[PDB]
Amino acid sequence: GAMAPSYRVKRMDIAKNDEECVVNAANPRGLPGDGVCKAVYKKWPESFKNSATPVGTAKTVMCGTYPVIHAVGPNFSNYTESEGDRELAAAYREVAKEVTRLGVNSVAIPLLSTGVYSGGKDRLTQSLNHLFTAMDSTDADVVIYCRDKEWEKKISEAIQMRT
Ligand SMILES: Cc1nc(N)ccc1Br
Ligand SMILES: [Cl-]
Ligand SMILES: [Cl-]
Ligand SMILES: [Cl-]
Incomplete structure (x- = not known):
């Protein structure tokens, strides 16, 4: 894990992320879909091979060696x-x-x-x-991606509050 595990928020396309893996906001059927799922399909198409999974579950598919977690x-x-x-x-x-x-x-x-x-x-x-509930027990650096200017501020405030 990271030397000092942290939470950060950035406002940009999650497809341009600088982290060691990405979580897709997936549909249950492994379809290209819209929004985050659409950007993920453009960037890591090979990760949609058998990505179909039920609601409330996550399944990883590797695009080369870069892991895409379909949640x-x-x-x-x-x-x-x-x-x-x-x-x-x-x-x-x-x-x-x-x-x-x-x-x-x-x-x-x-x-x-x-x-x-x-x-x-x-x-x-x-x-x-x-x-936070799920990820607080992990030692990975978590970077949250969003697109709205006001959401960025509110996520930023929520992270600083508990620090
Ligand atoms: C972080 C992000 N990236 C996209 N490409 C579309 C929606 C959102 Br929210
Ligand atoms: Cl962007
Ligand atoms: Cl959504
Ligand atoms: Cl957003």
Whole structure:
């Protein structure tokens, strides 16, 4: 792991990340999809070979030697809040498991279920807190990727708060 494991946030395309592996905000079917999943498909197409996996699970596929962790958050359009929250928490726990297994010293990670899977609600706080819950026991440097200027500020504040 990292000498002094940290959390950082950057506002840029997760496809340009400077970490040793990437988490895809995947769909259950391994399809190219939209947003983060679309940028990941353009950058690491070979990682979509057998990436299909259930909601609340993560599955890694190697693009050369660069690991892509396909993590499937719930679509809050189809889930109840209660059940959605359970599955979102589970996606992140499976990401922490995979980051450990792979022995990386850094990971680029997006906020699962905050885009087209959000059911039209702001889930920054909800998703970030499940991220921290899962990843706080890992020693990898975590870099969170986002695209909104206000979200960058709010994620930045939440990281500094607990430091
Ligand atoms: C970090 C990121 N990258 C993309 N390419 C699309 C959406 C988001 Br959020
Ligand atoms: Cl960019
Ligand atoms: Cl999403
Ligand atoms: Cl964003």
